[PDB]
Design a protein around this ligand. Structure first.
Ligand code: NA
Length: 240
């Protein structure tokens, strides 16, 4: 997250760190959202590589013991069947991970609430991105979980020629694009939380930014729109 602020440690208890085994240690690669005690939602592109993955819930500082972490292996990966790794702009950038064990819920570990199917945010709706991704273009991962305020940019604007043009689809949400705050590598797969009728819900799964950099004016961060995939998610969980 570029241009973020450190999150309070109990603000975003559905945020997870997806990590891969790197020698004798583990490394953060992506974010995710806990959606059942044994299921995580993330981006498909985060699981393209044939790595050994684990999920960490209750994480705040990747480089210190917080006293709240639960570590759980990933047992099964279900990527959206239309996902095509060499065409992120086509969409379908979403995957579900079934955890080896069910995690225990507490003030640091909670299920993400999802929007009702079909819900679209009005232009300029208040949202936060969260994650441990790079804090500058071509920088380094954050230590502590970051948040940044990114108002939504509706489809009519986001799909206009000076923004993303045809690359953005109605199955996506765009947010930010102010040139200061954005998602960045390592934030992929994590949540866009938007305040609707008094309650934060996870409306986006972080999908992509510009190749010209993370915080680029008129290139808002692009998220998979969770509300387009409610039936898919329920179908997967009910059949696994
Ligand atoms: Na930690």
């Amino acid at each position: 997250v570029v241009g973020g602020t450190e999150a309070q440690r109990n603000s975003w208890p559905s945020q997870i760190s997806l990590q891969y085994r790197s020698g004798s240690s583990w490394a953060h690669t992506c974010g995710g959202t806990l959606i059942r005690q044994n299921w995580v939602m993330t981006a498909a592109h985060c699981v393209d590589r044939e790595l050994t993955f684990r999920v960490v819930v209750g994480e705040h500082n990747l480089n210190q013991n917080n006293g709240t972490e639960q570590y759980v292996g990933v047992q099964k990966i279900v990527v959206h069947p239309y996902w095509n790794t060499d065409d992120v702009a086509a969409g379908y950038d979403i995957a579900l991970l079934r955890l080896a064990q069910s995690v225990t819920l507490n003030s640091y570990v909670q299920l993400g609430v999802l929007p009702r199917a079909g819900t679209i945010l009005a232009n300029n709706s208040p949202c936060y991105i969260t994650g441990w991704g790079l804090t500058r273009t071509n920088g380094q991962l954050a230590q502590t979980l970051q948040q940044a305020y990114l108002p939504t940019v509706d489809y009519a604007i986001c799909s206009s020629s000076s923004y993303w043009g045809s690359t953005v689809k109605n199955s996506m949400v765009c947010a930010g694009g102010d040139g200061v705050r954005s998602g960045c590598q390592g934030d992929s797969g994590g949540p866009l939380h938007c305040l609707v009728n008094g309650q934060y819900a996870v409306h986006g799964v972080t999908s992509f930014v510009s190749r010209l950099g993370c915080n680029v004016t008129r290139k808002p961060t692009v998220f998979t729109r969770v509300s387009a995939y409610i039936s898919w998610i329920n179908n997967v969980i009910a059949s696994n």
